[PDB]
Amino acid sequence: SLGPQVAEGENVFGVCHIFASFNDTFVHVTDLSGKETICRVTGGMKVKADRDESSPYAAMLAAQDVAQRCKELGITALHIKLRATGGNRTKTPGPGAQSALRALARSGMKIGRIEDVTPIPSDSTRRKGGRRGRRL
Amino acid sequence: CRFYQHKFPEVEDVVMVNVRSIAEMGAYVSLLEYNNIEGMILLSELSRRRIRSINKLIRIGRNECVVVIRVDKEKGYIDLSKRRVSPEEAIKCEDKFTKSKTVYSILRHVAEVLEYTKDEQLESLFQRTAWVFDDKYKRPGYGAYDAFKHAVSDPSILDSLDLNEDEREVLINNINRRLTPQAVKIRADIEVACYGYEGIDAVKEALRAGLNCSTETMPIKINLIAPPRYVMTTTTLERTEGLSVLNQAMAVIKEKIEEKRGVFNV
Amino acid sequence: AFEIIHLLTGENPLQVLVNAIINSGPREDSTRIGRAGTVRRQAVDVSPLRRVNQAIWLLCTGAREAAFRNIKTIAECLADELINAAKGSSNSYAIKKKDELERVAKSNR
Amino acid sequence: MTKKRRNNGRAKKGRGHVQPIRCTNCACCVPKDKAIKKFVIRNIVEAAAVRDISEVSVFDAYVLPKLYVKLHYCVSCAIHSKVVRNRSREARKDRTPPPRFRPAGAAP
Amino acid sequence: KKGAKKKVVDPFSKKDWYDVKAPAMFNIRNIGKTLVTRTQGTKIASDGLKGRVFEVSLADLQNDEVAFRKFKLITEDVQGKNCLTNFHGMDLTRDKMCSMVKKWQTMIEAHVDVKTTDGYLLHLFCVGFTKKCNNQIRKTSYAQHQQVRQIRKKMMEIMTREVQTNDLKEVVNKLIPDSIGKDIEKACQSIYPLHDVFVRKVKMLKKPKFELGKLMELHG
């Protein structure tokens, strides 16, 4: 796999786009622009049980593979963008947010920056569940 | 011995097992979709809903369809799961289980006579014969049964590669006994409503001409079910060669009867 | 046991036993956790003191099991069981049952 | 009819109606003045993963950003999650917040 | 049953690396690297490479310290494995914007649509917060409604004067140290002291023609 012709003293910086919350974890490594991208792995692909897709180790096992293919190509460092679901929903990270970072960093990849990005309305449309909401 | 083309299962493949014990942590089970190798099922990945009873689900002495989730190739630990199973997969796996049983029973007659004092005997027969039959036609969805079924109806398939002895008679007998009698569901649909009195002899000329370009001595099966309906089960091949026999014959009877008086059903 | 182990392979027959204990002790283990009135499992680690206690239990069950209808005496069975544990080969009751636990611990984790 | 609380369990004074808010856990409608409000400030990174991220970061001293979440609970969810507890007749009059650590330094 | 090759597609050995160069106003101009697919006659490299956005920090494009005031940059032209950029609008981080907002303050906001000396058109968004004052014993810092509407009026007046005059580049030069925001903080000080002024967004709404001569001035 052909990387760029220098990366010896510099690094090449990708964006990691970690997805958060329940019943799902994505890790989707992209360009700086985000226009084009590389491999994309889910916790539903590592673990099949339909109930461990949000688990810590399923998120770790995902990033443990994705981080190999990064360095295989020539992407060595990562800026990080987070995404919790939002849009008048839970708007809080899942379990597999803390998890994937700890695994991918110690696999050998560099971390450049980290930030929160979540789609938060300035007040928008009514939430599913009705007036009385879920119970049981 | 092995019932399957590969000795060890892969990853995400549908298989069959037979329960021999029930574990605390799931179910330890023997395969009968491969060798008698061990595979472990786990309790968590059996269903997505509660479980009151436990012997009204899995119990000993049951064929159960399952998916191989992981395998340790070197150690021989076949991790297993029953969580992802659809009834469509069960139909596909039951067929492959049943077809392998009959094919291995054919490849047991071979071992009745030859040196089989050691268990590995059938393994020797299996690898050399089975693979060249099924590998050539696995990509199109055929098992080694297709290759043998083709040999009985046209013998060049089993003469294209090493032909065994005494096998050929039992092979022919078992193919021709079990996969026949062998069959035509050809029935003619004919409707007539004559004002004729010469219709009785008119029909006789029409009946004997069910297949054009055949000898006058051709045996056929005439059937009378009702007065206007004339059913002729035409020459019995496989119903993919007697299509012209069925279609064009219907035109004969309806045409022959209109010439002798009045209008009829077409 | 030691007598049979020494004739049979030829070692200081305690080094056999020490390998047999160390090779039979689990590296990770599961336990139960109560959620929704339904069985869920959690992977956890294990003490060194637990490993020793478990490994001594497991191999002793092997020789007890084998000699329950065999012509072979328990001494013969036990010395065989320490060989196949000391050099892993999965013909023992121990190294089988060790790997069963770890195979579970991978799944639910 | 016995009155358990002088305030009827809400902060409505001199007002006719108050806009409802949705509970974060159960989506139930609760008046904004009856909702149990918890501001949660957390680092984006968990304390264990701070070392690994500082070693892999291209910057020698990166200041980690914070998550700012305003949680809105109904009374039922706040009791179930043990955010609020049952209090004696007298201890219900007390409005002092329970003391936390002390302060936002180090271990907490 | 095919041609030469070998096996799987390796769509990442058919891709071509590039570089992305910033204006001369930035001390470090080496933004980073991207890739597009090699040219085909059904869709060429440059047509799949233009019209992107490039989030870049300010303390990363301006070595070095600040941790926000992120800028968006679009590739308007390609030149022989170097992708030249142009201003598109600035934005701000979330955490900084969140941390300043807190209880017992009154938040003050306003915007304007404004035109440059050139053909660029911008739509700036600013913010002010009330000061927790010098030696309050009071636990509030709330202000009257009359006072607020003055502060908003005077926050527009400053931000139109400095952006209606002064061409596209000189706008950017005033926003990097934040001279714009700081000017408002002192000018409103008499009618309420105020700590903080930032411009949380600017959105380049319309822009004029390419203009190659004006283009290369920025990368001179």
Add this chain to the structure above:
Amino acid sequence: MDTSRVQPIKLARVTKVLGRTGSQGQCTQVRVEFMDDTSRSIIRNVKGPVREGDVLTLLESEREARRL
């Protein structure tokens, strides 16, 4: 593509015991020092009776404990 590539067997030692957890007290929270990095520390759940200063055999340090 096939199976997985995994980390090698780690060894990490106790610095302190914290308290017992689980729904019958069967799990034990513990703090452990990584035994190659002296400023690194992770919290774990360990089943067996432990004292302090004894060494464990971790298969990964990706996993981390919380409470349940």
Add this chain to the structure above:
RNA sequence: CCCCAUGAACGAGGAAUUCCCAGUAAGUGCGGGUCAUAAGCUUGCGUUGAUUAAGUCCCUGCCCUUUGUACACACCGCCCG
């Protein structure tokens, strides 16, 4: 009670469930009790002698406080069409 002969089920046990933390569990014998003749019972005694835990409120139950109640024959209560 003794002698000879006859030689069955039973080849480790479903759903469930009992009891036990140190000379303790388990194995093993003996004395006393009832007794004209007679312990597979009960009550005591020696002898051989482990594994596992150093915990918890999950289940079952109990003590203390706070809270709610149309209950006081006390939830096995009470009560609606």
Add this chain to the structure above:
RNA sequence: AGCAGAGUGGCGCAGCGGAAGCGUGCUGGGCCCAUAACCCAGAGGUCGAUGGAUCGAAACCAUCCUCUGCUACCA
């Protein structure tokens, strides 16, 4: 007479190329102070005849008979 089903191993329905299959019932046990609900445990045995392949046939496949279901006539 064309088509369809069956010719019990408790009942009723009859499931498929591995010798009771499904549903139900009866009888007994378990849980509970007790009942219901819930959980377990049963039972002499070519499954109308004549044949073939088969390790084996209610069940793998034929040749016959009878009873019924739908359609319907010879008489």
